[PDB]
Amino acid sequence: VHLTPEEKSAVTALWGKVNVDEVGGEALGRLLVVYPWTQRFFESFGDLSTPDAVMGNPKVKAHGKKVLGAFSDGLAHLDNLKGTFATLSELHCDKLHVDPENFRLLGNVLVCVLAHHFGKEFTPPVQAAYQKVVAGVANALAHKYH
């Protein structure tokens, strides 16, 4: 995604230090809590009437688990995301009917969860690249709408 080496370094460095098991879930829980309408796409998860069961909820953590794997996917497919998320594009759009704004919201949350755990070590410069990564995926994801 036209990123520079600089922006590639700062990233792949901080992604390694990512809790491949707890961040995906931290994100989806946060989306679901702040952008509650996103909850409609997750009835089969069950209890989400409060911020706590949401965060706690296994399925969420279980799902956020996969979601992130897709982010790590492109984070080493930066020259071809449109491809990387084709099927994922076909799912959320044609089959799920998820409004593309939400992808920009989730990734924007993904930047918040990352900004939580890595505090100071998440600098404006880093953000700017991630913001670029999230933009990519986000749009790359909306493609079956292009």
Binding site: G29, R30, V33, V34, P51, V54, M55, N108, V111, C112, V113, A115, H116, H117, F118, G119, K120, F122, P124, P125, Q127, A128, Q131
Partner: protein
């Protein structure tokens, strides 16, 4: 459009930031300027390089603006009334920028307050900043 409980987290969040105010506003601003570079075109004359005393002067002006909003919380159009004339009639800031700035204050606070940036919390500040922006961009004529 904020539940009495939201305001609670807004004041326990505002508090835990206190003197960092002017400091964090400057960091919220830099993230915006770097992450979303078009935003720079609204400050033609400024110097927006790191540690720019210009950004920091403004960052605080901004953070003060907020604490003032976190005050007259239910009479916002009126408290922030004047700022609405600057961003809406004089500057005509694309409303999309507000969303950009708000997302940065957020990321700024979750990296400097892990002790208070829990979910129920996060959604409170977002509802808030959004209402803040709605107003500052709500007078356009």
């Amino acid at each position: 459009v904020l539940s009495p409980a939201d305001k609670t987290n807004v004041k326990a969040a505002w508090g835990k930031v206190g003197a960092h105010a002017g400091e964090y506003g400057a960091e919220a601003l830099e993230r915006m300027f770097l992450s979303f570079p078009t935003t720079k075109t609204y400050f033609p004359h400024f110097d927006l390089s790191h540690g720019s005393a210009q950004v920091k002067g403004h960052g605080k002006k901004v953070a003060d603006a907020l604490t003032n909003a976190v005050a007259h919380v239910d009479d916002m159009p009126n408290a922030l009334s004047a700022l609405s004339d600057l961003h809406a009639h004089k500057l005509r800031v694309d409303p999309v920028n507000f969303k950009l700035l708000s997302h940065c204050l957020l990321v700024t606070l979750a990296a400097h307050l892990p002790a208070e940036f829990t979910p129920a919390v996060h959604a409170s500040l977002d509802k808030f900043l959004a209402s803040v922006s709605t107003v500052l961009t709500s007078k356009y004529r």
